[PDB]
Design an enzyme around this catalytic site. Sequence first.
Site, PDB file in Angstrom:
ATOM      1  N   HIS A 249     -16.419 -55.688  48.652  1.00  0.00           N
ATOM      2  CA  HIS A 249     -16.405 -55.952  50.088  1.00  0.00           C
ATOM      3  C   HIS A 249     -15.419 -56.469  50.651  1.00  0.00           C
ATOM      4  CE1 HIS A 249     -21.073 -55.667  49.549  1.00  0.00           C
ATOM      5  NE2 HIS A 249     -20.747 -54.777  49.714  1.00  0.00           N
TER       6      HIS A 249
ATOM      7  N   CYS B  90     -13.409 -51.662  52.182  1.00  0.00           N
ATOM      8  CA  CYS B  90     -13.753 -51.130  53.672  1.00  0.00           C
ATOM      9  C   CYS B  90     -12.317 -51.310  54.297  1.00  0.00           C
ATOM     10  CB  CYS B  90     -14.618 -51.966  54.249  1.00  0.00           C
ATOM     11  SG  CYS B  90     -16.265 -51.870  53.580  1.00  0.00           S
TER      12      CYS B  90
END
Length: 145
Positions: A51, A113
């Site tokens: 993440h 991301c």
Amino acid sequence: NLHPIGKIAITSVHLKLPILKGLSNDNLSAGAGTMKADQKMGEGNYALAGHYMTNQGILFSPLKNVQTGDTVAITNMKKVYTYKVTTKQIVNETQVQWIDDVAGKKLITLVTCASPTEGEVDRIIVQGELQSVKKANQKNLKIFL
């Protein structure tokens, strides 16, 4: 109780995280998760995802500051595998081929991301080529402290 299988360090961005098996949400929030079931350090294309950030703060977001020529090191506490970054790209999430084994290359591919925003479709990709495999001794393990 996630049971890390190794560690990753990128000194250029002060990143030091556990490597965990698989891409559970817990794993992706704690460190770098292995993207393929059968990958091995120092072989093929060793792919890791994390993440961009968590509730706590940054996780894999420092990848955005990694540059070509930076070193990335991983260890399983037996050997230390040092890779040299050959590219950093922002790509669409559909570009899954970035994690495929490449004939005659030993690669590491790091994925996160492109931002923390809801429904982000882009990914930061940092890829590197294996520079060395060394015994996990005090000298070589220091960078993982």
